[PDB]
Short mmCIF file of C-alpha atoms in Angstrom, two decimals:
data_model
loop_
_atom_site.label_atom_id
_atom_site.label_comp_id
_atom_site.label_asym_id
_atom_site.label_seq_id
_atom_site.Cartn_x
_atom_site.Cartn_y
_atom_site.Cartn_z
CA UNK A 594 -33.53 -9.00 22.26
CA UNK A 595 -33.05 -11.20 18.94
CA UNK A 596 -33.01 -11.76 15.24
CA UNK A 597 -35.48 -9.27 13.48
CA UNK A 598 -35.73 -6.90 16.44
CA UNK A 599 -35.90 -3.56 14.90
CA UNK A 600 -34.38 -1.04 17.37
CA UNK A 601 -36.11 2.52 17.28
CA UNK A 602 -37.89 1.13 14.43
CA UNK A 603 -34.71 1.94 12.53
CA UNK A 604 -32.00 -0.73 13.16
CA UNK A 605 -32.92 -4.32 12.59
CA UNK A 606 -30.63 -7.17 14.07
CA UNK A 607 -29.13 -9.95 12.30
CA UNK A 608 -26.68 -12.09 13.85
CA UNK A 609 -24.85 -11.89 17.44
CA UNK A 610 -21.49 -11.03 16.68
CA UNK A 611 -19.45 -10.07 19.58
CA UNK A 612 -20.12 -10.31 23.56
CA UNK A 613 -18.96 -9.16 27.00
CA UNK A 614 -19.19 -7.63 30.31
CA UNK A 615 -21.18 -4.83 29.36
CA UNK A 616 -23.47 -6.07 26.73
CA UNK A 617 -23.64 -8.08 23.25
CA UNK A 618 -22.44 -6.47 19.72
CA UNK A 619 -25.03 -7.48 16.75
CA UNK A 620 -24.53 -7.07 13.07
CA UNK A 621 -27.83 -5.09 12.10
CA UNK A 622 -29.22 -3.39 8.72
CA UNK A 623 -29.88 0.50 9.25
CA UNK A 624 -33.19 0.21 7.70
CA UNK A 625 -33.20 4.19 6.84
CA UNK A 626 -30.01 4.22 5.02
CA UNK A 627 -29.91 0.44 4.03
CA UNK A 628 -26.42 0.06 5.66
CA UNK A 629 -24.95 -2.93 7.45
CA UNK A 630 -23.81 -1.82 11.18
CA UNK A 631 -22.55 -3.04 14.35
CA UNK A 632 -25.10 -2.59 17.18
CA UNK A 633 -24.00 -2.29 20.69
CA UNK A 634 -26.92 -3.36 22.97
CA UNK A 635 -25.88 -2.60 26.19
CA UNK A 636 -27.03 -5.03 29.44
CA UNK A 637 -30.39 -3.77 31.49
CA UNK A 638 -27.98 -3.09 34.47
CA UNK A 639 -25.94 -0.52 32.30
CA UNK A 640 -29.37 0.56 30.46
CA UNK A 641 -30.99 1.46 33.74
CA UNK A 642 -28.13 3.65 34.91
CA UNK A 643 -28.60 7.12 34.57
CA UNK A 644 -25.23 8.23 35.08
CA UNK A 645 -23.48 5.33 33.60
CA UNK A 646 -25.29 6.17 30.71
CA UNK A 647 -24.37 9.95 31.05
CA UNK A 648 -20.73 8.95 30.89
CA UNK A 649 -20.90 6.21 28.26
CA UNK A 650 -22.42 8.70 26.02
CA UNK A 651 -20.32 11.70 26.35
CA UNK A 652 -17.38 8.96 25.37
CA UNK A 653 -19.27 7.77 21.90
CA UNK A 654 -20.56 11.16 21.41
CA UNK A 655 -16.73 12.17 21.10
CA UNK A 656 -15.27 9.14 19.24
CA UNK A 657 -18.28 9.99 16.86
CA UNK A 658 -16.90 13.49 15.80
CA UNK A 659 -13.72 11.61 15.16
CA UNK A 660 -13.01 10.55 11.32
CA UNK A 661 -10.14 8.86 10.50
CA UNK A 662 -9.01 5.57 8.92
CA UNK A 663 -8.02 3.93 12.00
CA UNK A 664 -11.06 4.96 14.20
CA UNK A 665 -14.04 2.64 14.04
CA UNK A 666 -16.92 5.09 13.35
CA UNK A 667 -19.63 5.69 16.16
CA UNK A 668 -22.91 6.63 13.97
CA UNK A 669 -25.41 6.87 16.66
CA UNK A 670 -27.10 6.16 20.23
CA UNK A 671 -30.40 5.24 21.04
CA UNK A 672 -33.10 3.75 23.50
CA UNK A 673 -35.86 1.63 22.58
CA UNK A 674 -39.21 -0.21 23.47
CA UNK A 675 -35.94 0.44 28.27
CA UNK A 676 -32.67 -1.03 26.27
CA UNK A 677 -29.69 0.96 25.24
CA UNK A 678 -27.94 0.74 22.40
CA UNK A 679 -24.82 2.53 20.25
CA UNK A 680 -24.59 2.10 16.57
CA UNK A 681 -21.26 1.61 15.06
CA UNK A 682 -18.98 0.63 12.14
CA UNK A 683 -19.28 -2.82 11.17
CA UNK A 684 -15.66 -3.59 10.73
CA UNK A 685 -14.71 -6.25 8.13
CA UNK A 686 -11.63 -7.44 10.09
CA UNK A 687 -9.96 -9.70 12.77
CA UNK A 688 -9.68 -8.58 16.12
CA UNK A 689 -5.76 -8.55 17.31
CA UNK A 690 -6.33 -11.62 19.79
CA UNK A 691 -7.94 -13.63 17.29
CA UNK A 692 -4.81 -13.28 15.27
CA UNK A 693 -2.38 -14.37 17.65
CA UNK A 694 -4.27 -17.59 18.36
CA UNK A 695 -2.75 -18.82 15.30
CA UNK A 696 0.58 -17.20 15.01
CA UNK A 697 1.39 -16.31 18.28
CA UNK A 698 3.78 -13.41 17.51
CA UNK A 699 3.39 -11.20 14.44
CA UNK A 700 6.02 -10.70 11.81
CA UNK A 701 8.37 -7.80 13.13
CA UNK A 702 6.93 -5.69 10.31
CA UNK A 703 3.68 -6.11 10.65
CA UNK A 704 4.23 -5.57 14.40
CA UNK A 705 5.64 -2.12 13.62
CA UNK A 706 3.12 -0.95 11.29
CA UNK A 707 0.31 -2.22 13.39
CA UNK A 708 1.97 -0.19 16.10
CA UNK A 709 2.38 2.74 14.31
CA UNK A 710 -1.29 2.59 12.84
CA UNK A 711 -2.72 2.27 16.10
CA UNK A 712 -0.56 4.95 17.47
CA UNK A 713 -1.94 7.33 15.11
CA UNK A 714 -5.62 6.58 15.48
CA UNK A 715 -4.85 6.97 19.14
CA UNK A 716 -3.82 10.29 18.66
CA UNK A 717 -6.86 12.03 16.51
CA UNK A 718 -8.35 10.72 19.84
CA UNK A 719 -5.73 12.30 22.20
CA UNK A 720 -6.00 15.53 20.13
CA UNK A 721 -9.82 15.73 21.06
CA UNK A 722 -9.38 15.12 24.61
CA UNK A 723 -10.16 11.61 24.35
CA UNK A 724 -8.63 8.69 26.00
CA UNK A 725 -9.28 5.20 24.84
CA UNK A 726 -8.68 3.60 28.77
CA UNK A 727 -8.90 -0.34 27.69
CA UNK A 728 -6.29 -0.60 24.85
CA UNK A 729 -5.84 -4.38 24.01
CA UNK A 730 -6.01 -6.67 21.28
CA UNK A 731 -9.63 -7.35 21.24
CA UNK A 732 -9.86 -3.57 20.46
CA UNK A 733 -7.52 -3.64 17.73
CA UNK A 734 -9.31 -4.87 14.15
CA UNK A 735 -7.04 -5.94 11.23
CA UNK A 736 -8.83 -6.08 8.10
CA UNK A 737 -7.78 -8.09 4.87
CA UNK A 738 -5.83 -5.31 3.40
CA UNK A 739 -3.97 -4.66 6.79
CA UNK A 740 -5.88 -1.44 8.12
CA UNK A 741 -6.01 -1.20 11.66
CA UNK A 742 -9.38 -0.32 13.39
CA UNK A 743 -10.08 0.75 16.68
CA UNK A 744 -13.24 0.00 18.80
CA UNK A 745 -14.86 0.97 22.30
CA UNK A 746 -12.97 4.45 23.12
CA UNK A 747 -13.59 5.39 26.60
CA UNK A 748 -17.04 3.32 27.32
CA UNK A 749 -15.85 0.06 28.69
CA UNK A 750 -13.89 2.28 31.57
CA UNK A 751 -17.43 4.55 32.06
CA UNK A 752 -18.44 1.79 34.61
CA UNK A 753 -16.58 3.99 37.44
CA UNK A 754 -14.81 1.01 39.30
CA UNK A 755 -12.73 1.37 42.41
CA UNK A 756 -9.14 0.67 42.24
CA UNK A 757 -8.13 -3.37 41.06
CA UNK A 758 -5.40 -3.23 43.84
CA UNK A 759 -8.34 -2.80 46.47
CA UNK A 760 -11.68 -4.75 44.71
CA UNK A 761 -9.12 -7.53 42.91
CA UNK A 762 -11.83 -7.09 40.13
CA UNK A 763 -11.93 -5.58 36.56
CA UNK A 764 -14.58 -5.59 34.07
CA UNK A 765 -12.89 -7.19 31.40
CA UNK A 766 -8.73 -7.96 31.13
CA UNK A 767 -6.24 -6.71 33.47
CA UNK A 768 -3.60 -8.26 31.17
CA UNK A 769 -2.75 -4.92 29.41
CA UNK A 770 -3.72 -2.42 32.58
CA UNK A 771 -1.69 0.84 33.09
CA UNK A 772 -0.08 0.51 36.34
CA UNK A 773 -1.28 3.88 37.33
CA UNK A 774 -4.83 2.68 35.81
CA UNK A 775 -4.66 -0.52 38.26
CA UNK A 776 -3.75 2.31 41.20
CA UNK A 777 -6.97 4.25 40.31
CA UNK A 778 -5.55 7.04 38.60
CA UNK A 779 -7.71 8.14 35.78
CA UNK A 780 -6.10 7.64 32.41
CA UNK A 781 -4.36 9.76 30.40
CA UNK A 782 -2.86 9.51 26.96
CA UNK A 783 0.11 7.95 28.37
CA UNK A 784 -1.97 5.16 29.57
CA UNK A 785 -3.02 4.14 26.11
CA UNK A 786 0.57 4.15 25.33
CA UNK A 787 1.93 1.80 27.77
CA UNK A 788 -0.95 -0.71 27.33
CA UNK A 789 -0.07 -0.46 23.39
CA UNK A 790 3.70 -1.07 24.51
CA UNK A 791 1.87 -4.09 26.23
CA UNK A 792 0.16 -4.97 23.09
CA UNK A 793 3.50 -4.56 21.26
CA UNK A 794 5.36 -7.14 23.60
CA UNK A 795 2.52 -9.49 22.91
CA UNK A 796 2.80 -8.92 19.20
CA UNK A 797 6.58 -9.17 18.47
CA UNK A 798 7.85 -11.53 20.99
CA UNK A 799 4.76 -14.52 21.22
CA UNK A 800 3.56 -14.12 24.84
CA UNK A 801 2.09 -11.17 26.74
CA UNK A 802 4.42 -9.59 29.25
CA UNK A 803 2.95 -10.40 32.45
CA UNK A 804 0.07 -13.59 33.63
CA UNK A 805 -1.22 -14.60 36.29
CA UNK A 806 -4.74 -16.54 38.01
CA UNK A 807 -6.74 -13.44 38.16
CA UNK A 808 -7.08 -9.83 37.86
CA UNK A 809 -5.39 -8.67 40.86
CA UNK A 810 -2.22 -11.17 40.17
CA UNK A 811 -1.57 -10.05 36.62
CA UNK A 812 -2.18 -5.93 37.48
CA UNK A 813 0.26 -6.07 40.74
CA UNK A 814 2.99 -6.99 38.58
CA UNK A 815 2.04 -4.00 35.98
CA UNK A 816 2.56 -2.08 39.02
CA UNK A 817 5.80 -3.72 40.29
CA UNK A 818 7.47 -5.95 38.23
CA UNK A 819 10.33 -5.15 35.57
CA UNK A 820 8.73 -6.82 32.47
CA UNK A 821 10.79 -9.96 31.35
CA UNK A 822 13.59 -9.09 28.86
CA UNK A 823 12.23 -9.50 24.89
CA UNK A 824 14.22 -12.02 22.94
CA UNK A 825 17.76 -10.98 22.35
CA UNK A 826 17.04 -11.59 18.08
CA UNK A 827 14.80 -8.48 18.07
CA UNK A 828 16.54 -5.43 17.02
CA UNK A 829 17.75 -3.39 19.90
CA UNK A 830 15.82 -0.29 18.50
CA UNK A 831 12.86 -2.45 18.76
CA UNK A 832 13.45 -3.89 21.90
CA UNK A 833 14.00 0.11 23.25
CA UNK A 834 10.92 1.40 21.80
CA UNK A 835 9.05 -1.44 23.81
CA UNK A 836 10.90 -0.94 27.23
CA UNK A 837 10.37 2.46 27.03
CA UNK A 838 6.49 2.59 26.27
CA UNK A 839 6.47 -0.03 29.70
CA UNK A 840 7.96 2.14 32.31
CA UNK A 841 5.97 2.34 35.53
CA UNK A 842 6.13 6.42 35.69
CA UNK A 843 3.63 7.66 32.92
CA UNK A 844 5.55 11.07 32.88
CA UNK A 845 8.45 9.22 31.50
CA UNK A 846 6.56 7.80 28.55
CA UNK A 847 5.82 9.18 25.15
CA UNK A 848 2.82 11.35 26.36
CA UNK A 849 0.50 10.19 23.50
CA UNK A 850 -0.25 8.28 20.18
CA UNK A 851 1.65 10.73 18.11
CA UNK A 852 4.85 10.72 19.81
CA UNK A 853 4.76 7.05 20.06
CA UNK A 854 3.90 6.59 16.34
CA UNK A 855 6.75 8.69 15.31
CA UNK A 856 8.88 6.68 17.65
CA UNK A 857 7.50 3.46 15.92
CA UNK A 858 8.73 5.35 12.84
CA UNK A 859 11.94 6.15 13.71
CA UNK A 860 12.29 2.44 14.55
CA UNK A 861 11.26 1.21 11.26
CA UNK A 862 13.56 3.50 9.73
CA UNK A 863 16.70 2.24 11.49
CA UNK A 864 16.84 4.84 13.85
CA UNK A 865 16.88 4.52 17.99
CA UNK A 866 13.79 5.52 19.86
CA UNK A 867 13.57 9.31 20.11
CA UNK A 868 13.65 10.80 23.45
CA UNK A 869 10.14 10.53 24.96
CA UNK B 1001 39.79 -1.85 -8.83
CA UNK B 1002 39.60 -4.30 -5.70
CA UNK B 1003 39.80 -4.66 -2.03
CA UNK B 1004 42.27 -1.95 -0.21
CA UNK B 1005 41.91 0.62 -2.82
CA UNK B 1006 41.29 4.15 -1.16
CA UNK B 1007 39.02 6.12 -4.13
CA UNK B 1008 40.49 9.58 -3.54
CA UNK B 1009 42.31 8.73 -0.60
CA UNK B 1010 38.82 8.68 1.21
CA UNK B 1011 37.04 5.87 0.38
CA UNK B 1012 38.42 2.16 1.19
CA UNK B 1013 36.52 -0.58 -0.55
CA UNK B 1014 36.12 -3.98 1.39
CA UNK B 1015 33.62 -6.13 -0.30
CA UNK B 1016 32.05 -6.71 -3.83
CA UNK B 1017 28.59 -6.35 -2.92
CA UNK B 1018 26.15 -5.81 -6.34
CA UNK B 1019 27.27 -5.53 -9.95
CA UNK B 1020 25.51 -4.51 -13.27
CA UNK B 1021 25.83 -3.02 -16.69
CA UNK B 1022 26.84 0.17 -15.87
CA UNK B 1023 29.51 -1.35 -13.15
CA UNK B 1024 30.19 -2.40 -9.63
CA UNK B 1025 28.84 -1.68 -6.05
CA UNK B 1026 31.42 -2.04 -3.27
CA UNK B 1027 31.22 -1.68 0.70
CA UNK B 1028 33.32 0.85 1.79
CA UNK B 1029 34.38 2.62 4.51
CA UNK B 1030 34.49 6.65 4.49
CA UNK B 1031 37.85 7.23 6.17
CA UNK B 1032 37.29 10.83 6.68
CA UNK B 1033 34.19 10.23 8.65
CA UNK B 1034 34.61 6.36 9.74
CA UNK B 1035 31.33 5.55 8.13
CA UNK B 1036 30.58 2.21 6.34
CA UNK B 1037 28.86 3.27 2.89
CA UNK B 1038 28.39 1.90 -0.73
CA UNK B 1039 30.45 3.28 -3.35
CA UNK B 1040 29.24 2.47 -7.44
CA UNK B 1041 32.39 2.44 -9.15
CA UNK B 1042 31.71 3.22 -13.29
CA UNK B 1043 32.95 1.15 -15.78
CA UNK B 1044 35.26 2.66 -18.10
CA UNK B 1045 33.06 2.46 -20.91
CA UNK B 1046 31.41 5.46 -19.01
CA UNK B 1047 34.06 6.79 -17.05
CA UNK B 1048 35.39 8.09 -20.26
CA UNK B 1049 32.11 9.65 -21.69
CA UNK B 1050 32.28 13.32 -20.62
CA UNK B 1051 28.71 13.59 -21.42
CA UNK B 1052 27.32 10.51 -20.09
CA UNK B 1053 29.11 11.89 -16.85
CA UNK B 1054 27.34 14.92 -16.85
CA UNK B 1055 23.85 13.41 -17.16
CA UNK B 1056 24.56 10.92 -14.59
CA UNK B 1057 25.88 13.59 -12.09
CA UNK B 1058 22.82 15.80 -12.70
CA UNK B 1059 20.57 12.90 -11.48
CA UNK B 1060 22.41 11.74 -8.46
CA UNK B 1061 23.33 15.90 -7.96
CA UNK B 1062 19.53 15.67 -7.27
CA UNK B 1063 18.86 12.83 -5.08
CA UNK B 1064 21.81 14.00 -2.89
CA UNK B 1065 19.42 16.72 -1.91
CA UNK B 1066 16.50 14.53 -1.09
CA UNK B 1067 16.28 13.43 2.52
CA UNK B 1068 13.72 10.77 3.10
CA UNK B 1069 13.65 7.46 4.83
CA UNK B 1070 12.33 5.82 1.63
CA UNK B 1071 15.01 7.39 -0.49
CA UNK B 1072 18.62 5.77 -0.80
CA UNK B 1073 20.93 8.40 0.44
CA UNK B 1074 23.31 9.81 -2.35
CA UNK B 1075 26.51 11.23 -0.50
CA UNK B 1076 29.04 12.29 -3.19
CA UNK B 1077 30.71 11.83 -6.24
CA UNK B 1078 34.26 11.46 -7.46
CA UNK B 1079 37.04 10.54 -9.79
CA UNK B 1080 40.22 8.82 -8.68
CA UNK B 1081 43.49 7.73 -9.95
CA UNK B 1082 40.22 7.83 -14.31
CA UNK B 1083 38.00 5.73 -11.80
CA UNK B 1084 34.46 7.40 -11.83
CA UNK B 1085 32.22 6.72 -8.69
CA UNK B 1086 29.40 7.69 -6.70
CA UNK B 1087 29.01 7.20 -2.93
CA UNK B 1088 25.89 6.15 -1.24
CA UNK B 1089 24.10 4.81 1.66
CA UNK B 1090 24.72 0.78 2.75
CA UNK B 1091 21.54 -0.15 3.07
CA UNK B 1092 20.96 -3.17 5.51
CA UNK B 1093 18.01 -4.60 3.24
CA UNK B 1094 17.42 -7.04 0.60
CA UNK B 1095 16.35 -6.11 -3.05
CA UNK B 1096 12.84 -6.85 -3.45
CA UNK B 1097 13.88 -9.39 -6.48
CA UNK B 1098 15.46 -11.36 -3.84
CA UNK B 1099 12.54 -11.44 -1.41
CA UNK B 1100 10.23 -12.93 -4.17
CA UNK B 1101 12.74 -15.68 -5.38
CA UNK B 1102 11.49 -17.27 -2.13
CA UNK B 1103 7.84 -16.53 -1.50
CA UNK B 1104 6.78 -15.95 -5.44
CA UNK B 1105 4.23 -13.43 -3.89
CA UNK B 1106 4.35 -11.26 -1.31
CA UNK B 1107 1.10 -10.93 1.67
CA UNK B 1108 -1.33 -8.66 0.33
CA UNK B 1109 -0.95 -6.63 3.51
CA UNK B 1110 2.81 -6.15 3.09
CA UNK B 1111 2.57 -5.52 -0.66
CA UNK B 1112 -0.14 -2.71 -0.27
CA UNK B 1113 2.65 -1.36 2.42
CA UNK B 1114 5.74 -1.56 0.10
CA UNK B 1115 3.78 0.17 -2.60
CA UNK B 1116 2.61 2.52 -0.93
CA UNK B 1117 5.93 3.39 0.99
CA UNK B 1118 7.29 3.12 -2.76
CA UNK B 1119 5.12 5.73 -3.84
CA UNK B 1120 5.98 8.64 -1.01
CA UNK B 1121 9.24 8.19 -1.78
CA UNK B 1122 9.45 8.63 -5.62
CA UNK B 1123 6.84 11.64 -4.96
CA UNK B 1124 9.41 13.83 -2.95
CA UNK B 1125 11.69 12.58 -6.00
CA UNK B 1126 9.08 13.61 -8.55
CA UNK B 1127 8.14 16.93 -6.50
CA UNK B 1128 11.75 18.03 -7.19
CA UNK B 1129 11.51 17.32 -10.86
CA UNK B 1130 13.24 13.78 -10.58
CA UNK B 1131 11.74 11.01 -12.61
CA UNK B 1132 13.51 7.80 -11.48
CA UNK B 1133 12.94 6.10 -14.52
CA UNK B 1134 14.08 2.39 -13.79
CA UNK B 1135 11.83 1.43 -11.07
CA UNK B 1136 12.04 -2.54 -10.74
CA UNK B 1137 12.24 -4.99 -7.87
CA UNK B 1138 16.18 -4.58 -7.86
CA UNK B 1139 15.81 -0.70 -6.57
CA UNK B 1140 13.36 -1.77 -4.03
CA UNK B 1141 15.44 -2.61 -0.69
CA UNK B 1142 13.26 -4.09 2.12
CA UNK B 1143 15.44 -3.70 5.61
CA UNK B 1144 14.27 -6.17 8.65
CA UNK B 1145 11.82 -3.38 9.88
CA UNK B 1146 9.99 -3.48 6.42
CA UNK B 1147 11.53 0.19 5.54
CA UNK B 1148 11.63 0.35 1.85
CA UNK B 1149 14.50 2.09 0.41
CA UNK B 1150 14.69 3.29 -3.13
CA UNK B 1151 18.09 2.71 -5.14
CA UNK B 1152 19.37 4.69 -8.22
CA UNK B 1153 17.37 7.32 -9.41
CA UNK B 1154 17.67 8.43 -12.81
CA UNK B 1155 21.38 7.13 -13.31
CA UNK B 1156 20.64 3.86 -15.30
CA UNK B 1157 18.57 5.94 -18.07
CA UNK B 1158 21.53 8.69 -18.45
CA UNK B 1159 22.92 6.27 -21.12
CA UNK B 1160 21.03 7.85 -23.73
CA UNK B 1161 19.66 4.88 -25.22
CA UNK B 1162 17.44 4.47 -28.57
CA UNK B 1163 13.83 3.18 -28.89
CA UNK B 1164 13.99 -0.58 -27.93
CA UNK B 1165 11.55 -1.01 -30.45
CA UNK B 1166 14.15 -0.46 -32.78
CA UNK B 1167 17.25 -1.31 -31.23
CA UNK B 1168 15.97 -4.87 -29.65
CA UNK B 1169 18.29 -4.28 -26.53
CA UNK B 1170 18.09 -2.57 -23.36
CA UNK B 1171 20.45 -1.81 -20.35
CA UNK B 1172 19.22 -3.92 -17.39
CA UNK B 1173 15.47 -4.95 -17.94
CA UNK B 1174 12.63 -4.33 -20.26
CA UNK B 1175 10.33 -6.52 -17.55
CA UNK B 1176 9.13 -3.34 -15.91
CA UNK B 1177 9.32 -1.04 -18.74
CA UNK B 1178 6.46 2.02 -19.47
CA UNK B 1179 5.46 1.43 -22.73
CA UNK B 1180 6.00 4.89 -23.64
CA UNK B 1181 9.50 4.44 -22.44
CA UNK B 1182 9.85 1.46 -24.78
CA UNK B 1183 8.89 3.75 -27.37
CA UNK B 1184 11.42 6.16 -27.22
CA UNK B 1185 9.47 9.32 -25.22
CA UNK B 1186 10.90 10.36 -21.91
CA UNK B 1187 10.01 9.18 -18.87
CA UNK B 1188 7.73 11.09 -16.67
CA UNK B 1189 6.50 10.61 -12.95
CA UNK B 1190 3.59 8.55 -14.37
CA UNK B 1191 6.19 6.12 -16.08
CA UNK B 1192 7.75 5.67 -12.61
CA UNK B 1193 3.81 4.56 -11.50
CA UNK B 1194 3.25 2.35 -14.32
CA UNK B 1195 6.52 0.67 -13.62
CA UNK B 1196 5.87 0.46 -9.46
CA UNK B 1197 2.23 -0.96 -10.97
CA UNK B 1198 4.24 -4.04 -12.51
CA UNK B 1199 6.16 -4.15 -9.47
CA UNK B 1200 2.70 -4.50 -7.42
CA UNK B 1201 1.22 -6.86 -10.21
CA UNK B 1202 4.27 -9.22 -9.49
CA UNK B 1203 4.23 -8.63 -5.55
CA UNK B 1204 0.40 -9.44 -5.12
CA UNK B 1205 -0.12 -12.33 -7.93
CA UNK B 1206 3.08 -14.27 -7.47
CA UNK B 1207 4.47 -13.49 -11.07
CA UNK B 1208 5.10 -10.50 -13.38
CA UNK B 1209 2.49 -9.55 -15.80
CA UNK B 1210 4.50 -9.97 -19.05
CA UNK B 1211 7.42 -12.43 -19.84
CA UNK B 1212 9.61 -13.25 -22.94
CA UNK B 1213 12.74 -14.34 -24.47
CA UNK B 1214 14.58 -11.07 -24.64
CA UNK B 1215 13.93 -7.38 -24.41
CA UNK B 1216 12.29 -6.67 -27.49
CA UNK B 1217 9.49 -9.56 -26.71
CA UNK B 1218 8.61 -7.93 -23.20
CA UNK B 1219 8.82 -4.55 -24.27
CA UNK B 1220 6.42 -4.75 -27.18
CA UNK B 1221 3.61 -6.90 -24.82
CA UNK B 1222 4.17 -3.48 -22.79
CA UNK B 1223 3.20 -1.42 -25.59
CA UNK B 1224 0.51 -3.64 -27.06
CA UNK B 1225 -1.34 -6.34 -24.40
CA UNK B 1226 -3.40 -5.83 -22.24
CA UNK B 1227 -2.08 -7.76 -18.57
CA UNK B 1228 -3.62 -10.69 -17.92
CA UNK B 1229 -6.67 -10.72 -15.17
CA UNK B 1230 -4.87 -10.85 -11.54
CA UNK B 1231 -6.32 -13.87 -9.37
CA UNK B 1232 -10.09 -13.56 -8.84
CA UNK B 1233 -9.41 -14.17 -5.05
CA UNK B 1234 -7.93 -10.54 -4.68
CA UNK B 1235 -9.99 -7.77 -3.46
CA UNK B 1236 -11.82 -6.10 -6.53
CA UNK B 1237 -10.60 -2.69 -5.01
CA UNK B 1238 -6.85 -4.18 -5.11
CA UNK B 1239 -7.06 -5.33 -8.39
CA UNK B 1240 -8.79 -2.06 -9.56
CA UNK B 1241 -5.92 -0.03 -8.19
CA UNK B 1242 -3.19 -2.27 -10.28
CA UNK B 1243 -5.12 -2.15 -13.11
CA UNK B 1244 -5.42 1.55 -13.05
CA UNK B 1245 -1.99 2.04 -12.86
CA UNK B 1246 -1.30 -0.34 -16.00
CA UNK B 1247 -2.87 1.56 -18.73
CA UNK B 1248 -1.11 2.50 -21.69
CA UNK B 1249 -1.53 5.94 -21.88
CA UNK B 1250 0.25 7.62 -19.64
CA UNK B 1251 -1.94 10.61 -19.30
CA UNK B 1252 -4.73 8.28 -17.70
CA UNK B 1253 -2.59 7.03 -14.85
CA UNK B 1254 -1.94 8.32 -11.57
CA UNK B 1255 0.22 11.11 -12.67
CA UNK B 1256 2.94 10.73 -9.80
CA UNK B 1257 4.52 8.90 -6.61
CA UNK B 1258 1.90 10.86 -4.27
CA UNK B 1259 -1.17 10.47 -6.08
CA UNK B 1260 -0.43 6.27 -6.29
CA UNK B 1261 0.21 6.35 -2.34
CA UNK B 1262 -2.97 7.68 -1.57
CA UNK B 1263 -4.79 5.23 -4.21
CA UNK B 1264 -2.86 2.34 -1.98
CA UNK B 1265 -4.08 3.93 1.42
CA UNK B 1266 -7.72 4.47 0.06
CA UNK B 1267 -7.60 0.55 -0.96
CA UNK B 1268 -5.80 -0.42 2.18
CA UNK B 1269 -8.36 1.68 4.32
CA UNK B 1270 -11.30 -0.68 2.49
CA UNK B 1271 -12.16 2.21 -0.50
CA UNK B 1272 -12.24 1.93 -4.42
CA UNK B 1273 -9.21 3.54 -5.91
CA UNK B 1274 -9.46 6.96 -6.50
CA UNK B 1275 -10.05 8.90 -9.65
CA UNK B 1276 -7.01 9.48 -11.55
#
């Protein structure tokens, strides 16, 4: 699993570009079309699990039928000679977590824009029956021109993990988890909204709203802790928009990506956040 | 014409906030609704001209029927005891020329956003038969949240000035003039597009494309001079988008605000500028 390997005789691996709990992402060339792409190569522990692969493919498949500037394309699945993989768009952009490592916060203007873009991208997905379920800065790529591209819809949460409250463990991070997810309820479009509110909270104010040593620590605060008031210098309408997104009851939030994005637009336009 | 004057017994002047060739703009309170507003009080030389007032009102009137986040509202016209005025939205934002006095250029991301916002705002106007005719940074207000608001549709150009090529004089600036306007042709939606391309050229690169000592100097360069190549470090698609906007023949540009904005979206999204 390395440079020069040509998966299913089609996709030639060039460089290792991302990594994670489920596998690694590589820059490749599609040699049938002579197009550079991203390939997520799954770890054997996932490749070898029939049922996990079924759920994984169900999500990816749906994402591959969505055409929108803010959804990173999903091109194909394959297995090669044992080794499962997903072929994706190679996005020329920088993960939001990377961006913030430098700036601490985003400019208010850029934050709202990003939030609104992400919300429109999620809404296409939500309209198709598709929940992201792992919204977080590492899944929000920003290109040089400011286009937000959203990666990895559905797939991380296809591992059918028990509640974090009971296991004390999460694949990836619990820093953006929706409280109902941390409880073991299946995500809904309102869960993505909440997790985008966390991203939003981070992006405007400088820091995430909840921290702690370990998944269980942070996840519990999501369930039980009112978030710390955002900085008083932020327009109240902006603060209020974010506060709404972070209510514990999913039934009391903006219900999906479109209503949220619209609420971001009303706020950019100087109006108070609309009724969720 | 000063603080405490209550125009037509309704609008009470508070503070002098803008100024210019045609008159002055004041912060006021509407005392019928208890709402803060902006009032353009016209100079006597314009108040006293029947025909100029007719054309002035024809433009303002049309703008007042457009409801869009990017068009600064036009609320009413009146005359008080002699003195003509136009009642407008009081926009809490900073003119683009003001912004640039500090930053020199905008960030690429902010520039595209502004351009696209302005283009959508112009398109509503263009769809109504309304041309702005004096697109320039001083008519592009930017609020703390990044909402662009466009002021003064139509009205500056209601003075029915002869060609700048022949008079050597322009009311306001010639720095953003469309070549066909500088020639004495009536503006079209494509003229606004061109002038937004100049704004765009300025906003991305640091400086306006044409300068010179006096209206005639700059206006002639608009007619005759190919603009200086934009900085090579800018994405080619961005450069190309702007180059298209600045062709001399209006018939070869994006024809109105919507096609332009769409072209800005394609470029933000990493695609080359669409066919005008």
